[PDB]
Amino acid sequence: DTARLDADPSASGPVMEFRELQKGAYIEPTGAFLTRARNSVSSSIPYPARAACLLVAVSQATGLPTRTLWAALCANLPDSVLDDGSLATLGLTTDHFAVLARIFSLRCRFVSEHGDVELGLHDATSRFTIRHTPGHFELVADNFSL
């Protein structure tokens, strides 16, 4: 289903996987998600200031400023892939990471409950490891308060 992507005024050309749009030595399945080239429209989408953990993690690992990571994303993804509706609350995904890996030459072993997944490029000059914990519910005391 590419409805939002076909209707995106910030996109141009045909729909294809990102790893086909920006070819590189990707670690399968990095970049498999569908996207379109970004045209000249400038992104309104603001920096996800309340959901920036992935940018922070990559910034700490590489010394790359978070605003630079964000600028690179805004130049290389159309708005409908940059923000599928949940960016401001759930933040970036490993789809976004694929773009950062291609531009900045990165590879990261993502550690999660069900198993590790390494994403990025086989010829990356920066390598690091990030723990991914998914959203989840936990039973707490009746009068629990943050």
Author numbering: 9 to 154
Q: Which lines from the publication concern this structure?
A:
Maize rayado fino virus (MRFV) is the type member of the genus Marafivirus within the family Tymoviridae. The polyprotein characteristically contains four nonstructural domains that comprise the viral replicase (methyltransferase, protease (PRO), helicase (HEL), and RNA-dependent RNA polymerase (RdRp)) as well as the major structural coat protein (CP) for genome packing. The main function of PRO is to act as a polyprotein processor, but it has been shown to have auxiliary function as a ubiquitin (Ub) hydrolase to aid in bypassing the host innate immune system by removing Ub from the RdRp, preventing its degradation by the Ub proteasome. X-ray structures of MRFV PRO alone and bound to Ub reveal unique structural characteristics that differ from TYMV PRO and notable conformational changes that occur in response to Ub substrate.
PRO adopts a compact, three-domain fold, although its C-terminal conformation is held in place by a neighboring copy of the enzyme. The second domain (green panel) is predominantly a well-ordered five-helix bundle (⍺3-⍺7). Helix ⍺3 contains the catalytic cysteine nucleophile (C61) with its solvent-exposed thiol group at the N-terminal end of ⍺3 (Fig. 5A (arrows) and Fig. 5B). Domain III terminates with what appears to be a flexible loop that is solvent exposed until it inserts itself into the active site of a neighboring copy of the enzyme. This loop contains the active site histidine (H144) that is ∼17 Å from the catalytic cystine. The ∼17 Å distance between the side chains of C61 and H144 does not comprise a functional active site. The asymmetric unit (ASU) is composed of two copies of MRFV PRO with most interactions occurring between the alpha helical bundles of domain II of each molecule. The C-terminal tail of each copy of protein in the ASU traverses into its neighbor and appears to complete the active site of the neighboring molecule. The catalytic C61 and incoming His144 residue of the neighboring symmetry mate arrange themselves to within a few angstroms of each other and appear coordinated for catalysis. MRFV PRO is monomeric in solution according to size-exclusion chromatography, and this dimeric interaction between the monomers of the ASU is most likely a crystallographic artifact. Interestingly, aside from the terminal proline (P142), our crystal structure of MRFV PRO reveals that the enzyme lacks a complete GPP motif.
